[PDB]
Amino acid sequence: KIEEGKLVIWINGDKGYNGLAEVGKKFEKDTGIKVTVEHPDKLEEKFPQVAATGDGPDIIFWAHDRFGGYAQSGLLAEITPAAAFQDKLYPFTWDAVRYNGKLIAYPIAVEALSLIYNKDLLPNPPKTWEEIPALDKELKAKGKSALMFNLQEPYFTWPLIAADGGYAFKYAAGKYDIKDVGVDNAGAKAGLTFLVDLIKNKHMNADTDYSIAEAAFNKGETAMTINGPWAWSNIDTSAVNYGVTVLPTFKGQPSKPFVGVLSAGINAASPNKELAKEFLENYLLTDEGLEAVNKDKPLGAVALKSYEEELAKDPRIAATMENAQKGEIMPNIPQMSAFWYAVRTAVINAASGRQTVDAALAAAQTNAARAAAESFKEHLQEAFEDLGADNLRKFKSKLGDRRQEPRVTKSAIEKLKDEIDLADLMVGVFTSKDAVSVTVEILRAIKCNAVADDLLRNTLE
Ligand SMILES: OC[C@H]1O[C@H](O[C@H]2[C@H](O)[C@@H](O)[C@@H](O)O[C@@H]2CO)[C@H](O)[C@@H](O)[C@@H]1O
């Protein structure tokens, strides 16, 4: 499925992929070899499904937190450059791509979130989170609002949850301890309570996503947003006059974002391994290669010393590195994808009012330690689709009548939209193993025995 004598590359659709295609045209004009760039949907989950049997791209781009799990499954080739090349990039960027003693990818650039504001609507931005409710009121009298950002992905809400004390896994004596999880302490509860109260008092809406918020800022309808360096380009095209600065404090403490390093790995089953090393070391990681990508969509603070010393004179970049020093570098261990699925479910149920804050975070502490939890959620979704709409109305009636603990209110059931919402409510209230046991019990009481049997052989077994 992988053809000898050319190169195929995969990268996310919010980065500068037309700029990267210009670098491959130059490689073709010096050697004749053709390069193709693609941007599929959900690529961080498609890559481990196709590469296990030897298919996929020659080269894959993503942040460093996903790569430890790919290496444990045997999907990547080892990286081995000469000491003369290694001295061209900062030593702290090589530390982020080192796993069990070996290097497993090439580092490209450093990314962190900041606060972006409209100078004509608000020439002096606020220094604390506590000030935002009163400022929303002044702006409505002009037909506007104060702040809008993406509420569906937990990367954007984590800086406030961590300000007064929350954490992922505890670091002690040279290693992360995978059975000491920090999403349910006193500091984590206070930050999530402040976010839900903004929604209750009608300063924000619970269905806001990435493209809704991007259009409102660029049209002048809102005063502030929260985003990374890749977004600066489309703002330049618009009519808005903008600045970039440090995030606000909470209870007197700084906000603390998680920082990522964009990186490039090589497929263990590729037959083009030495063509791939020549493209990356001699064409992309140079002054003129990185300049072509940066002009399409900006990269942040790059890994190559000779070019980063010039970019550091830009005041937008100085603010990016101040937020990075108040935050923390992400771990790369294989347990990180189970952590991100658990926190995503907790924020969605609490912002929509289907669960209380305290009950949602106590279940996340348990789900974050279970490797197979997200797989169980996908098998529940498929069983609800197979019942059909008439039989699924009977299922939801019996769930609302249960007297066993924990109980589910009838108002919360009427607010669901489809089969994906129902599977997320079940794993968030009961945790993942108990969710399957209760579902099988209700299916037997409405006489749907074939569906219950198929679900059992693919989970608890
Ligand atoms: O929301 C969970 C998600 O966060 C990070 O993904 C970022 C990525 O690093 C950025 O480059 C940008 O594309 O936005 C993404 C969030 O929408 C983690 O790297 C990722 O593993 C995680 O699932």
Other Cβ atoms less than 10 A from the Cβ of 301: the count is 21
Q: Which amino acid is at 187?
A: G
Per the DSSP assignment, residues forming a β-bridge with 259 are 329
Looking at the chain, how many residues does it have? 461
Cα distance between residue 93 and residue 304, in whole Å: 10
- Can you say whether the dihedral through the CA atoms of 346, 349, 351, 356 is positive or negative? negative
Q: Which amino acid is at 369?
A: A
Q: Whose CA is nearest to atom 4 of ligand 1?
A: 155
Give the H/E segment covering residue 390: helix 389-401
CB of 289 sitting under 6 A from ligand 1: no
CB of 155 sitting under 6 A from ligand 1: yes
Closest Cα partner for 334 from 74, 9, 42?
A: 74
Six token digits for residue 170 = 């505890």
Q: Which amino acid is at 40?
A: P
For this PDB entry, the determination method is X-ray
Q: Which amino acid is at 327?
A: G
Other Cβ atoms less than 10 A from the Cβ of 38: the count is 12
Q: What is the Å distance from ligand 1's center to 23 Cα?
A: 25
Token pair 């030897």 is found at: 54
Q: What is the Å distance from ligand 1's center to 211 Cα?
A: 16
Q: What is the Å distance from ligand 1's center to 253 Cα?
A: 24
Among 155, 320, 339, name the best residue to mutate to test ligand 1's pocket (greatest count of ligand atoms within 8 A of Cβ): 155
At a CB cut-off of 8 Å and minimum separation 6, what does 85 contact?
Answer: 281
Q: Where does residue 347 rank: exposed (0-12), middle (13-18), buried (19+ CB within 10 A)?
A: buried
CB of 12 sitting under 6 A from ligand 1: yes
CB of 14 sitting under 6 A from ligand 1: yes
Cα→Cα distances 423→107, 400, 460, Å = 38, 15, 17
Cα distance between residue 45 and residue 52, in whole Å: 12
Q: Where does residue 340 rank: exposed (0-12), middle (13-18), buried (19+ CB within 10 A)?
A: middle
Token pair 């009163």 is found at: 134
Cα distance between residue 382 and residue 378, in whole Å: 7
Q: What is the Å distance from ligand 1's center to 414 Cα?
A: 32
Pairing verdict, β 59-63 and 7-10: parallel
- Judged by DSSP in three states, 117 sits in strand
Other Cβ atoms less than 10 A from the Cβ of 330: the count is 17
Cα distance between residue 21 and residue 151, in whole Å: 32
Q: What is the Å distance from ligand 1's center to 155 Cα?
A: 6
Token pair 């020093």 is found at: 325
Which atom belonging to ligand 1 lies closest to the Cα atom of 66?
A: 21
Closest Cα partner for 207 from 144, 150, 145, 146?
A: 150
- Judged by DSSP in three states, 293 sits in helix
Give the H/E segment covering residue 202: none
Six token digits for residue 394 = 């009977």
Residue pair 354/363 in contact by the 8 Å Cβ criterion: no
Token pair 């490689």 is found at: 27
Q: What is the Å distance from ligand 1's center to 451 Cα?
A: 35
Closest Cα partner for 113 from 260, 296, 276?
A: 260
Which atom belonging to ligand 1 lies closest to the Cα atom of 210?
A: 17
- Can you say whether the dihedral through the CA atoms of 332, 338, 341, 346 is positive or negative? negative
Cα→Cα distances 327→98, 111, 227, 260, 362, Å = 21, 12, 15, 11, 25
Cα distance between residue 266 and residue 79, in whole Å: 9
CB of 153 sitting under 6 A from ligand 1: yes
Token pair 């206070």 is found at: 190
At a CB cut-off of 8 Å and minimum separation 6, what does 6 contact?
Answer: 33, 34, 35, 36, 272
Residue pair 179/199 in contact by the 8 Å Cβ criterion: no
CB of 154 sitting under 6 A from ligand 1: yes
Indicate which CATH number applies to the domain containing 220: 3.40.190.10
- Judged by DSSP in three states, 205 sits in coil
- Directed axis angle between helix 336-351 and helix 357-367, to 10°? 160
Q: What is the Å distance from ligand 1's center to 391 Cα?
A: 38
Residue pair 162/323 in contact by the 8 Å Cβ criterion: no
Which atom belonging to ligand 1 lies closest to the Cα atom of 14?
A: 13
Residue pair 351/206 in contact by the 8 Å Cβ criterion: yes
Q: How many helices (H) and strands (E) does the chain have?
A: 22, 15
Give the CB-side neighbour count of residue 54, counting CA atoms within 13 A: 5
Cα distance between residue 171 and residue 329, in whole Å: 12
Q: Where does residue 335 rank: exposed (0-12), middle (13-18), buried (19+ CB within 10 A)?
A: middle
Which atom belonging to ligand 1 lies closest to the Cα atom of 150?
A: 17
Range of the domain at 236: 114-258
- Can you say whether the dihedral through the CA atoms of 73, 77, 78, 83 is positive or negative? negative
Q: Whose CA is nearest to atom 23 of ligand 1?
A: 340
Q: Whose CA is nearest to atom 3 of ligand 1?
A: 155
Resolution (A): 2.0
Q: Whose CA is nearest to atom 15 of ligand 1?
A: 155
Six token digits for residue 430 = 């009961």
Cα distance between residue 408 and residue 401, in whole Å: 8
Which atom belonging to ligand 1 lies closest to the Cα atom of 156?
A: 1
Cα→Cα distances 166→173, 193, 322, Å = 20, 13, 21
Cα distance between residue 348 and residue 377, in whole Å: 15
Residue pair 381/419 in contact by the 8 Å Cβ criterion: yes
Token pair 């061209």 is found at: 88
- Can you say whether the dihedral through the CA atoms of 368, 374, 375, 377 is positive or negative? positive
DSSP codes, 316-363: HHHHHHHHHHHSEEPP--TTHHHHHHHHHHHHHHHHTTSS-HHHHHHH
Q: Whose CA is nearest to atom 8 of ligand 1?
A: 63
Residue pair 33/7 in contact by the 8 Å Cβ criterion: yes
CB of 297 sitting under 6 A from ligand 1: no
Other Cβ atoms less than 10 A from the Cβ of 418: the count is 10
Six token digits for residue 449 = 């025995």
Cα distance between residue 396 and residue 413, in whole Å: 7
Cα distance between residue 308 and residue 236, in whole Å: 22
Q: What is the Å distance from ligand 1's center to 342 Cα?
A: 15
Six token digits for residue 369 = 């330690």
